[model samples]
Target: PNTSLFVPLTVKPKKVLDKFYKRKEIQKLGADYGLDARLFHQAFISFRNYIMQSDIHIVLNDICFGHADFPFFLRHAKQIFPVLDCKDDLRKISDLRIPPNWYPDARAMQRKIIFHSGPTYHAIQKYFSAKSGVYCGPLKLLAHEIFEKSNAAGVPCDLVTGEERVTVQPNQASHVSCTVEMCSVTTPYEVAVIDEIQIRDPARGWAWTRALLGLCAEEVHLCGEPAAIDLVMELYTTGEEVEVRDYKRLTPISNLRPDCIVCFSKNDIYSVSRQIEIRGLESAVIYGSLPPGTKLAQAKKFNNDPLVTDAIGLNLSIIFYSLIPITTSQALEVTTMILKRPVDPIRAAGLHPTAEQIEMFAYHLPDATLSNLIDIFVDFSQVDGQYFVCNMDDFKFSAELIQHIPLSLRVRYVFCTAPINKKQPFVCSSLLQFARQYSRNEPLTFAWLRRYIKPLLPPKNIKDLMDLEAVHDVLDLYLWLSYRFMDFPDASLIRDLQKELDGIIQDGVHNILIKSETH
Candidate 1:
């Protein structure tokens, strides 16, 4: 018999894992990133052993982020305590732990419902409908669109979003239109609509899932791609009135006529734009680095308008109207991703411990950072396999910035998850300042912040233009912080500043486009 070419592991990484991740270069790379190189390699080894040898084939179908490190997250023992006895010591972190099925509505459905998966609006003018309903959207702009559609048709609608709450009737509005995260789970409504229901974004998925599982509505119309249908069907029962509709589009989803071009970097965008211009064909360009006003104006010239999709959805994709020759090692994954099947059965919904839950856990681990507490809860908590927690890797940077502020752990958690990009120093420094003021019981007044904020001017170049964008983002984070902390920085003033900055950025974009560059 011929000798086997592959070496089988006899005992441990003692054989291979050590040799791979323990390499001088690999360890150095891990050190640079502050990541433990051995953690993943060990997980992979255990994962291989589980599926290939341990015959834990049942886990194969339930593919999820958790499954990537099956042993590390799931190897803990579970304790079943007597409910009556445990209630007395609910003070204990273990006792304070809410079960995955803590909410009655989420645990079981209770309504005469119509599950419209394809996804609507308006009241009274059309027909007999729910007295009060809310349209839950993924973005503030999208939610506002629904409110606009409703108000045009004579319904009293209000738009509630992270940035602003535009109320038609302060408290007596007939409809509440807002982002999914802001959707009321306890307030009973006649009807609800969750837009873009299928995009289970790892970070935003928890909000969508919570709305789907817990929204207190007589009827819900879920609109999105077809990928999430399986998860909905598998997790809960659909009644006689319940129907899942799949809407098909007739377009060049399969290589149709393309026009718009998208690129990630400013350099690449400039390079592409110049090449097209040098060929005697001028082209409009826009990016986050560009001023928003200029970006919007550029789009309108080509009859392109912002609608349901936002930039975040388009970031990974770099679509071109014509095949220009270029291969980016950076975007090969994105190209392959878009080319691959657009449908994958959404296996799990993103989960995060509630503020109450997090607070309880934090009380026990008094010294842990908000980021570490998040990790412990997600990894150690015994929850339904269908729920996969959002990893707090993104929160790590934000956590470090606020690590010194002697605020409540719960308060720190709020600031850490404010969706501010740490790459931009403006937002980071602004967060630290606001947090420090909060510590001193100082109200974050918009006037105070405006005084503290650097003034924005028309840009001489792309560098200046992006700085203006950074200020805009810093304000966005300020608004987010305002929503949580009662009467801190006056968000009303911030909104006014944002609208003003928009024009400045737009003018700056035009300024740079017309000028020759050297800096």
Candidate 2:
């Protein structure tokens, strides 16, 4: 969208159009013809009714707009039509049958399609997952696993995430993948493997549901544990054709403290936290919202079990010294909740500012700061209860962080999404530096980007790993910017640089383990 390859529009629409209709006789001519009193209104209406409704087909493509025409366009064009009534179809396929004794009912009805279930829950998910299937996962690390594996097999797998994108063409020989949140809602896939986990996630569960309902695939494989089986069944029986299967992943060397008390519910985690403290052992609580560097500190350590089977060993790095729970039922419930995630029927999918909304908003408050505009949008915008305005915290924080930058209002708004963590000084300064160059008509070459990323020498231990991750964070934000904006250097080299960094970190940790010998 930021392609500067196309020359920017020079003529202004409102200015040009306003002049065209300014003549008193020109306005009189429009009224005399019984066209709408305004040219803009009549312009599209005439095209649709006078031209399009006729047999002639035409496709209208407009490259850029100077005025706020789309909202007006939306107002003029937005209307719904009744659903198509079905009729008998013996004349179509059944007409080929011998003597054509029967025909389809004159109605649109639910058709049964099979979905497989498990011998075991996660394996049902994992085996059924790989057997069937774009590849989607819940997290970045897991998504990268798919991208890397697909690349080695010579399939052109394109990896797209919220901020990162690896562009390999999606031919028949190739596959496209992303985090579950990034499913191609509009592009029909032949097979869609929605992530097995996170179905029960309160906030993000809707993405999986959207993927399931909207998949244009022939076999829509909805992965899951038994937790969501009933809920999903209920969702589609209004007219759904789905059946269940269940089952379950792998890994390695370990030595760690049992002090990490695990609970699926944060409230319960704290409750269990004190239960351990009641026994006089100090506890470090780690929740997902923890900052990245500090999160590393916890990972070097707050962390889970099955009631021995169902609850423990989810994390690949985690080896619990003594993962405790307040209750076995607590652990079982946590395990089940995770073997399945937790979600209610989607309240509504979250939405953020639309280009239409933002432009319309900025027009009204042209002088307002980006921060003020966003706050106005959150308060003044009309939305249904089912949908919510999400990530206002991120929006609010980002706008404020670069309030110091003198970039244009629009660029400033976009820069807010660069995902710089306020806690990481290196990452924040890199953004500040990058934006300065970007605003000054600079092209951020791949060399400059790689130089900026400069990963720590292969991580020697937890502290070094933490440092490596911080550098990785810098690279991540850079990639986020690079992929989205055309100005930054191409991502392929940086992608290679990142993987080498990954290799170094992996090999360094291998050495760390050899030296550690579980101590």
Candidate 3:
């Protein structure tokens, strides 16, 4: 129980002590101290052994640990210690000599501070120093589009993203640049425009925050939804002149005129595009899955071609949306089947069209063939070759006919109908309520929907429809309803809910403003 007596230290062997005493410098130092050489050498050997046994390994190279006039003692220790030529050792020694005030005061620093000098740093500096800049949204496709547009306009902007294919063109004199992340906004520019600023990305939001506050620029413009207005204002507390402008869609919210039609599903896009071709209207199609060169071609056609007023494709939300001739091929097929055989189109289509027992010629066709057959049945003038039938689903058909169609086209009529079903009404209602709740940042759980949206009469399967897909569908419906049905029956209810949410948002904004002022 005596704690004072801890673990005993191990003594160096007699042979090792003999070698230490034999060292010339140790013997000389021992003589200067007026002590027996063996005694001083033994004590020094014990100290060295203790240090070697512990976790810390001391390398005393060109370092003197002895008192003044103890040159022989210092030289002896230096010879015994291992000479460390390792990089890590040098780095550690260098770090030890660094002054406490080596780093500049970050708060008062005006000049750019680069932590690393890699390829990434060079690329960033190149873009950040541009005279003008466009902050791309989260989508790389959007950034590529902006970069290409800038380059086409003779501005020669670099694409600043992790994408290897599109990189900074060093030879080109880039006066502007586009980027998904705002990390490139380290240097000031004459003008800077941030796109899709409403995205509340938790992980990468700090990059936007940094750019918004730290970007040294003359004029800064932010483009995003109204939801971001308060958030942006909250961030910009430096008494800078902030302006919020609301922009309405240039074209009326309908499926007509120098228009673009956006289809959520792949099948729908192909059907709509084929229909446009049948109508003899030039068209351009853009989709996320398309090659960059293809997308560029399609985009160019849509932007340049006078005949290509109608654009049908995917990724239409980031581009433009107008209107198209046909809505859903199912709807047309249904109408055709009803008029032709007075039977259910679903069952007809479900049963193999090429079956020998099939009574109706239209019922026995493939989806693509049936789609075109319905058009031919409706109008005899829509003969083969006269009216183009490009079935995107069929690889052979798409390969042969896709090139004939322009990348962009103009539209005249927008058929606003879909395939009929019992669940359509319920889905539409649930979707509306879901969209309303989402826009308000309210909970969109089953319980939330059931409690507040009972009047909307969601489907019995609403509980089963709890997934990201359902949410996406609801969002799509919400967008479509907002565009198509301005004075919809539930429009007033949605507006009322929106107003309440807006008030809550305003209150939160007010609190933020108050907090900022207090701070």
Index of the highest-TM-score prediction: 1
lDDT of 3 by residue, 1-519 (tens): 111211122343233334555677657765554334443454466555644453111323323332122344333333332111121332222221111122223122332311111002232333455565445445546666556656765566666553222335654343444454433544545555555553254334434444554555555556654545554453322444466656544443214366545554545544555566567665665544333444455666555345122223123432122323433321110111012233222110000111121113223222223233323222221212111222212222222232232211110000112111223445445543443443455544334433543323222221322222233233333333443433333433443443333333323221222112123
TM per candidate: 0.70, 0.52, 0.32
At residue 3, candidate 1 shows an lDDT of 9
Worst 10 residues of 3 by lDDT: 346-355
**How displaced is residue 417 in candidate 2, in Å?**
2.8
Give model 2's TM-score versus the native structure. 0.52
Error of 2 at 403 (Å): 2.4
Ranking by TM-score: 1, 2, 3
Q: In candidate 1, which residue ranges exceed 4 Å CA deviation?
A: 1-100, 105-109, 112-130, 237-242, 253-258, 279-282, 286-298, 304-318, 321-342, 511-517
On residues 1-519, what C-alpha lDDT tens digit does candidate 1 reach at each position?
010211122332123333534466644543343223443344345534543454334544444323122222123100111111222232343321333244466445565434444313222222125577888888655666567767777777787787677777644566878989888877777778877775367777878877876777776667665657777664443231446755554333432122445564556665666566566655666665544445557656555422101143311222533223432211221221133333446787776666777686555554456766556555445545666666667776788888898888778878787887777888789889988988989897877878876657677765666677888887887888778886665788787888888888776654344333544
1 or 2, which is superior by lDDT? 1
Error of 2 at 406 (Å): 3.6
